[model samples]
Target chain A: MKEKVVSLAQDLIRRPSISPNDEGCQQIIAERLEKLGFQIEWMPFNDTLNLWAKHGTSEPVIAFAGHTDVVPTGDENQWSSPPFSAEIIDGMLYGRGAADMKGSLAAMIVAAEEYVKANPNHKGTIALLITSDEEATAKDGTIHVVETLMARDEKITYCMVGEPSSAKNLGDVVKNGRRGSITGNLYIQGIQYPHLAENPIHKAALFLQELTTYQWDKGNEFFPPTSLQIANIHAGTGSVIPAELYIQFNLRYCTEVTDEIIKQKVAEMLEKHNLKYRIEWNLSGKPFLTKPGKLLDSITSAIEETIGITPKAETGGGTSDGRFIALMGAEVVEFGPLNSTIHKVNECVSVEDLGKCGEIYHKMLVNLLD
Target chain B: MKEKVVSLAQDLIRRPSISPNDEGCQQIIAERLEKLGFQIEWMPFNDTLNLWAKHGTSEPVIAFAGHTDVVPTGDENQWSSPPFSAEIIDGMLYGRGAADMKGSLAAMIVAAEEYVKANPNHKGTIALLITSDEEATAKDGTIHVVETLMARDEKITYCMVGEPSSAKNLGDVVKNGRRGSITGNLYIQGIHLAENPIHKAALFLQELTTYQWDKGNEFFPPTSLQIANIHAGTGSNNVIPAELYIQFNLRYCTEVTDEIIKQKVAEMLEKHNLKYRIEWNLSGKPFLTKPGKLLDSITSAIEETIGITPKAETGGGTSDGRFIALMGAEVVEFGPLNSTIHKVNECVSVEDLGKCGEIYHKMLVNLLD
Candidate 1:
């Protein structure tokens, strides 16, 4: 099982499948799933490829979700080993997406195949959801497939997204939720003269100070405190006072506050300051939490049984495809390998962790679907 | 004298001598001065032409200061006549530099020639200081000449700059002084994060606006500070900028010195605990002539020649008079109507240039006779 997971992860990494492009990684998994009598369905949208394969048609559909794509290797020369070579040194596999999702993806695929081969008569549906564009502009990947599935009223009772969720060791952590993300691009208008015309930067300064320091709320048990970061700011014409100021800021918010509440609070602040301004908001996801339930209980027990460490359910890090799956009223959780080196140069995953992840995923199937 | 001034002004306007380029305008005046028994000295600096012509070598030197260069005619097609044609329409001489300085320039030249030819052995020197770069940088022009003359202890007791000072008609107003000009370029160092740097700006702006330098003295009105420019941030949606820049300009009166302004600002920045870097460019220092001999002579001459009670003023934009005043000379700027100078369709009244020539000749007589 360790050799199967390690070799499969290496083969997937060697293809250099950088976002929205599978590079035949999905085809390899499809061939293995097909031999296990699982029905394969291809859902291609715009520039993304998605593979939804499943066995058995019954209630409580359980799915293992992951992506085949990885972010670009920023500077190839900065890597200790070639990014596309998928070299293994000191029991760790090194590549661009080795730890990101490819290693966990290979583990889930082998676990699903082994589970289906062992039990030909499972009670409920066991499924795998794979996409090619999870790292860049995930607009057309799982979101489109989930939209298609939801349109037909298909059921997804529980979903386990193979994101790099472990902070230190395998089965150490599993994310039961994610904070919502929203960005606001603001333009404060003013005349463009030094002495005669007003300056927007001056007019909006106090308001921006207030906005940056404003407290939204104390987060609930499953989530951390909401936070905001001012990503960009610009103004001025070099010699003349600027006509307007442009500012872009983003918020990672908890369930204690909704997007509407945040927008209304900012509007009230702008009005109180008497600022002539415009704002544009882009909401990427709404916070979703899976309370202690049957799905989480079964996965938690399987991790404890297989890896022997009771996983702590967390709600941290950035947004993921699990956010889309959670919109279908499914209990979604993310469990995978260590995430320390996922987006950095010379990203690698432990071969031992990959094998243990496969066993844990296999045990989850037995505890839930058998 | 009026015919000569008008014809000379017409000849000057036709040359198209746009800033730092004499285009033979100075050659024409030099030949006329040389023929009138004046010693013509060319003090040519980098890309600028200066002529210092004198009739006698004595104390209390009286100089008529002017420039031959004109600012660019923004759009030739927008003019009633071609910018360099020197065309006359309805008793107005139309051209690019008609009223800025060339019209007054020709008036001074003819006035000096007439005065020198009449009084060849006058009591003191009667000189004409002309430059070709005054309309632009004014760097290599009268400033350079003044520096050179001061180096040799050559004194100019009284100077009349042909800067078209009249507000409504010829001899309506005369400028006896000018405000000093200075600019400050500041870089306000902050975290460059959107909210972080903006907080610094908010704190700095209220303090900057509160800095009241001193009240103007009896010789000048209130000195005002104007923030002319500000620039900050990189052009991006994701970057947290690393620096912010601000630029401000001030026109101050004689009540405050450049050192005082600099020190006050530094103290203010220190009080606010702001991390900042600053650079100051002193364009000119304040100068005032309060009812002095040279100023009285210029005021009397304008009234005698143009039949107007010319009002004395010490406020306006800068001129060649500032450079001349630095040489320990009581400088005054009195010329034709200035409403149309340095603008499109620039024109000077034909009758006004004639009166300006007479007033200039009268001033030289009051200084030298």
Candidate 2:
């Protein structure tokens, strides 16, 4: 089983499949799943490749979601070994997307293969959803498939997104929810002259001080407090007073504070300064959470049985394709390898952790079906 | 004497010698100066023609400095007469460079010629430094000549810059000094993820706005600084900027030097714990001629010629006198009314040109004779 997971991950990593490019990894997985009597459907949207395969179509569909795409090797020369080598150095599987999702993704695929082979005649439907563009624009990836499934009234009762959810150790942390992200583009108007006291940067300074320090709410047990950061700011004509100042800031917020609440509070703060300005807000994703229930119990039980560590069901990290899957009213949970080196230059995953993640995932399907 | 001055003025105004172009103007002055037995040197750099003429090479070198070039005659069709006609209607001589010191430059030249022919055996040195590139960059004009003379270790004791200084009436205002100018280019580092450079800049700005550099003395106003431009960002909201660039300019006074200003800013930056790199560009140091022998001579000459005691103060953009002031010379700028200068049909009063020549010749007589 460990050799199967490690061998499949190495085959996928050897392709150097940068975002939106499957590099034939999907074809290899489809061939294996097809031999197991799983029906395969390829959905190609422009430059995005999506693979939806299922076996025994019936009630309570349990789908394992993953992405074949990976972010680029930031600087290949910075790597100790070649990024596309898929070499097993020491006890780690080293590659660009090795820790990100490829290693965990392979583990999930192998677990599904083993579970179906063991329970050839088990109850309920088992499914696999994969995309080739989750790490890039993600426009035509899982969202399009999710929309298509919703239009056909086909429902997913349980979803396990094979993202790298571990922080320190595998099976130690699993995300049950995620926070929403919003960005604000602000422009402050003023008379541009030195002698005048009406510089827009000066006026915006007070507002920025208030926004950075303002605590929106005490987060719940599953989520932390909201975070805000000023990403960009600019003003001036090099020899005259700045007539306008442009500032862009992003906020990672919990469910306790809605986007409306954040926007209103910012408007109120700017109004107190009596400044001349306008702000445009962008809400990229809304916060979604799955309460403790059957999906959580099965995944937690699987982790404790396989890895001997009772995984903590916590909401953390950034948004993922799990965000779109949760829209189908599925009891979504993310569990996988350590995410410490994801999207970085020297990304790698522990060889031992990959084998353990596969056992936990295989136990999750068994605990749910049998 | 007045006819000679007006004739030279007309000859100059007819040519339309706009900025760095001689149009045979300097040659005309050099011919008259050569006939007066004054040594003539044509130091031409690029397109600018600089004429340096000296008479008695002794102590107390009094140099009359002026520019033959004039600003463009914007909208010449709007003039009452053709811009280069040298027309005289009522009491004003109408042309492009009339009041902008062509008329006054003619007056200075006639004064120098008459003084040299009459005095022939004066005590100190009498000279004229004229350039054809004052209305533009003024780069290769008086500044080059000043640098050349500085390199030679030669100096001018007193410099009379024939700038059109009278604002209300003739001889009403004479610029005795000018405030200094300086610019600062500052770059601060606060990488996007560590901390926001904008927030850190706010604290520094609050303190900078309130910090008093100096108190003004009687001669000049208090120093003032203005932030011209500030920029920082990668445009993307998720990424923080790596550096903040700020450009600031200062119009300083004699109360504080550039060194003190820079030191105070250095202390301020250190106090705020900012990681920054800065460069200071000094345009000019404050040049004031305070009640000296040369200034008294100018006052006596202006009072005797224009029949009014000129007010000596400074509050204007720089002039050619700032360059000559580097030679440690007492610099004073006085001429006809400047109201009509650098405009359509820029004109100077005919009677005022006569008095301006009298003032120039008397000023030389008072200082050099």
Candidate 3:
């Protein structure tokens, strides 16, 4: 049964579904779900494709959230195996998005299919929330579907997001939460005079100094402190004259601070310097923490029983569809493949880890619902 | 006499000789000089046409120097009369170089001709060193001719330059000397890293704004300095510019040598430890006549003719006469009203042009024979 999951993951990885493009990855998953008496619902917006498949009509709704999209292979020539070939070299399936969600998406699907077939009449609902636009701008992917489902009063009590969570080895790390992401785009004003002119670069310099140095927080148990990186900057008339300046930066923040506080502090710094500038912000997702609860304890025990390793709860990395599912007041945790080479060339997933991940996901579902 | 000078000036002006390109002004003068017993020497170099015609082969060569070139007619329609028409109305002659040098140039030619005709074998040489380039990038005009003559050891003892020196009336002022001109093109470095841009800003501006060249002497005002152009910044202001550029001009004087000025400026930048590149250009070498024989004679003549008691000054703009003065010759610039020399309605009073011709002729008689 785990071999079946590995083969399905290889098939999906072989398709060059480069960000926001399903490339028929959803059709394959929908056919698999339809085989197990699950109703398939296709939801696509703009260029992104999504899937809403479910089985059983009951009280407790248990959802498995994942994406079929993969980040583009950064340098194809550097890979030992072709990115879209899904070559299995030494018990490892290699390709783009192999370790990132695609391998995990296979494990979750097989675990749900095997469990539903065995327990012909399980207690609660089993659902899969699959989207095709998580690796790029995710404006119309899981967020849109989640909004539509929530508007109709649809409920999801527990969600397991199939993200590549294991850091050093399989079943070692599980994400209990995620840090919020925000980016600032700012332009400072400058005078028109020559050397006698007021330089905007100089004006923005003080703002950068204050912004990069300010302490957002000392992290609590489940998260690390905030970090900021200046991604891009610009100012000038192409040297025909003195320059006016523009700067862009990103902040990855922890649970100790909220997105609202970060915005206020940045605005205060700009005002403190008495600078004339224009600034706009983009908040991808806010920080969330799912403490030790029923779903967390059940998944931890299941990974220990099936994979022979204890899973530690942790929170790091980017936002996922789990963040949107958690908005339905659902307990969300992520466990999947080793995240060593998701977006990089030579991205590969251990065939053994895929089988073991399927067993662990199946055991957790049996403990919760059967 | 003024009418002859006016007609000749009009003919030269009509050529539209935009600095260094004389069109046919030099040929007209060359033909006239050939008719006289004067030996016409066409010392042509590159694009500039120089006429060095001599009347006598004497030891002490007295020369009258001027350029046929006129400054650009900035806005032609702004002129009450067309700039090149040499329009005469209400006792004034209108033209581009009427007060600049074309009017003064014709006066010098006529002065030389009259002096030569009256005293064919004057005790000293009566020569004219005329060039068709003096107003724009005067590289190939009098300077080149002077270099060629100096290389062969040609001698010039006295030179009277017709450079529009008078302020209100004819012969009211005489330029006994001129302040030197020098330009500096400086490049200052900026930081290579975008974020750490301020590291380069302070050091560069400090080096640019702090260097002092000279403490001008009594005759010249403290070396007038003007920042003609300054530019800097990387194409994107976000990225600190890799280079900063500054161009500044200095109107210097005899108090400091070009070598010393360059050295002191270099030392200042080095003391500041700034990474910089520089190019220094010496436009004119400072020359002065602190009440010399020629200066006294020209001052006395202006006082006699114009009745305004002319001042023998070392201040004013630069002229081609600076090149001739470099030959150990006594050089002086005296001419008509400069108020309208290079402007719209550019005109010289008829009375002044005739009086300038008289002043030039008298100066020749005073210094040559």
Q: Chain B TM-score for each model?
A: 0.82, 0.86, 0.83
- Model 2, residue B325: distance off in Å is 5.5
Model 3, B1-369: lDDT tens digits are 667777777788788887788889989987887788889888888888988988888768888888888888998768888888877899888888888878888888887888787887788888889888888767788888787778899999888888888876667778877766667776656431223433333333434343344556676655545444344433334233355555556666777777876786677667555577899876566777777678877877776667777877777765876667656677778887788766677888777777777878878777765
Q: List the residue pairs that clash in candidate 1.
A: none
Worst 10 residues of 1 chain B by lDDT: B231-240
Candidates in order, interface RMSD in Å? 5.4, 4.4, 8.4
Clashes in predicted model 2: 1
* DockQ scores of the candidates: 0.26, 0.28, 0.08
User: Which order, best to worst by TM-score?
Assistant: 1, 2, 3
Per-residue lDDT tens digits for candidate 1, residues A253-276, read 988998999999989988887779
Q: What is the per-residue lDDT of model 2 for residues A261-362, given as tens digits with 9 covering 90 to 100?
A: 999999999988777888899887767787888889999999998878888888866768887887788778999898889988889999999999899889
CA RMSD (A), model 1 = 5.1
Worst 10 residues of 1 chain A by lDDT: A191-200
Number of the top-ranking candidate, with DockQ as the measure: 2
Give lDDT tens digits, candidate 3, residues A184-283.
8877655231231134344455566666567789777887778776555453332133334456678888878988899999999988867788888998
